Design an enzyme around this catalytic site. Structure first.
Site, short mmCIF file in Angstrom:
data_model
loop_
_atom_site.label_atom_id
_atom_site.label_comp_id
_atom_site.label_asym_id
_atom_site.label_seq_id
_atom_site.Cartn_x
_atom_site.Cartn_y
_atom_site.Cartn_z
N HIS A 47 0.12 2.32 14.49
CA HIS A 47 0.53 2.28 13.08
C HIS A 47 0.59 3.70 12.46
O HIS A 47 1.53 4.03 11.71
CB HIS A 47 -0.46 1.43 12.30
CG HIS A 47 0.02 1.13 10.92
ND1 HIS A 47 -0.57 1.65 9.78
CD2 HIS A 47 1.07 0.39 10.50
CE1 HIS A 47 0.09 1.21 8.71
NE2 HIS A 47 1.08 0.45 9.12
N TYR A 51 3.93 5.84 10.97
CA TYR A 51 4.04 6.55 9.68
C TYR A 51 4.38 8.04 9.95
O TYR A 51 5.13 8.67 9.22
CB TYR A 51 2.70 6.51 8.91
CG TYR A 51 2.41 5.25 8.12
CD1 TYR A 51 3.29 4.18 8.12
CD2 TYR A 51 1.24 5.14 7.36
CE1 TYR A 51 3.03 3.03 7.39
CE2 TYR A 51 0.96 3.99 6.63
CZ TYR A 51 1.86 2.94 6.66
OH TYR A 51 1.61 1.80 5.92
N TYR A 64 7.84 -1.87 -0.78
CA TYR A 64 8.98 -2.52 -0.14
C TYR A 64 8.91 -4.03 -0.39
O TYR A 64 7.91 -4.55 -0.92
CB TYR A 64 9.04 -2.20 1.35
CG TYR A 64 7.78 -2.58 2.10
CD1 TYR A 64 7.47 -3.90 2.37
CD2 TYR A 64 6.87 -1.61 2.52
CE1 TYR A 64 6.30 -4.24 3.07
CE2 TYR A 64 5.71 -1.94 3.20
CZ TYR A 64 5.43 -3.24 3.49
OH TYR A 64 4.26 -3.46 4.13
N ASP A 89 4.57 -1.54 9.17
CA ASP A 89 3.48 -2.43 8.71
C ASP A 89 3.56 -3.79 9.37
O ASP A 89 2.55 -4.34 9.76
CB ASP A 89 3.52 -2.62 7.20
CG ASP A 89 3.10 -1.36 6.41
OD1 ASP A 89 2.66 -0.32 6.98
OD2 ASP A 89 3.18 -1.35 5.18
C1 LIG Z 1 -6.30 -1.88 4.64
C2 LIG Z 1 -5.09 -1.03 4.89
O1 LIG Z 1 -4.06 -1.15 4.25
N1 LIG Z 1 -5.28 -0.15 5.86
C3 LIG Z 1 -4.42 0.77 6.36
C4 LIG Z 1 -3.11 1.01 5.95
C5 LIG Z 1 -2.34 2.00 6.57
C6 LIG Z 1 -2.90 2.74 7.61
O2 LIG Z 1 -2.21 3.73 8.25
C7 LIG Z 1 -4.20 2.50 8.01
C8 LIG Z 1 -4.95 1.52 7.39
#
Ligand SMILES: CC(=O)Nc1ccc(O)cc1
Length: 121
Positions: A47, A51, A64, A89
């Site tokens: 994740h 980003y 979004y 996400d």
């Molecule tokens: C709870 C929450 O949104 N956590 C979260 C969101 C983005 C990320 O890169 C890491 C953690």
């Protein structure tokens, strides 16, 4: 945005983003380094890399839109950044769902000196 990632996670897993996924392992929550501790933490790692592919986007604050077509997450059209943030996400939420079976409380509030390693996105 961070509020809808929170709500996507809750919908997918039944766990609240805070605190279940905000201080987990080395990359869930607030994370910068080391080797991911387990599958769920690898989801957070991926994740973060996702980003990281969007230097001129603002994931935490840009909102979004998305809808659920029977459980499937469908990102609705917005700006180029919103579309791509949404896809990052969605992937994370699915990754979380897939690895719920191995989620482990021993990795909650995991100490920062135990994050040792190197890994490239
Ligand atoms: C709870 C929450 O949104 N956590 C979260 C969101 C983005 C990320 O890169 C890491 C953690």
């Amino acid at each position: 945005s961070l509020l809808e990632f929170g709500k996507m996670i809750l919908e997918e897993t039944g766990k609240l983003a805070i605190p279940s996924y905000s201080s987990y392992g080395c990359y869930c929550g607030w994370g910068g380094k080391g080797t991911p501790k387990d599958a769920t933490d690898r989801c957070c790692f991926v994740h973060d890399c996702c980003y990281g592919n969007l230097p001129d986007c603002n994931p935490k604050s840009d909102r979004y839109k998305y809808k659920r077509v029977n459980g499937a997450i469908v990102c609705e059209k917005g700006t180029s950044c919103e579309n791509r943030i949404c896809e990052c996400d969605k992937a994370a939420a699915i990754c979380f769902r897939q690895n719920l079976n191995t989620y482990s409380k021993k990795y909650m509030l995991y100490p920062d000196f135990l994050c040792k390693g190197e890994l490239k996105c």
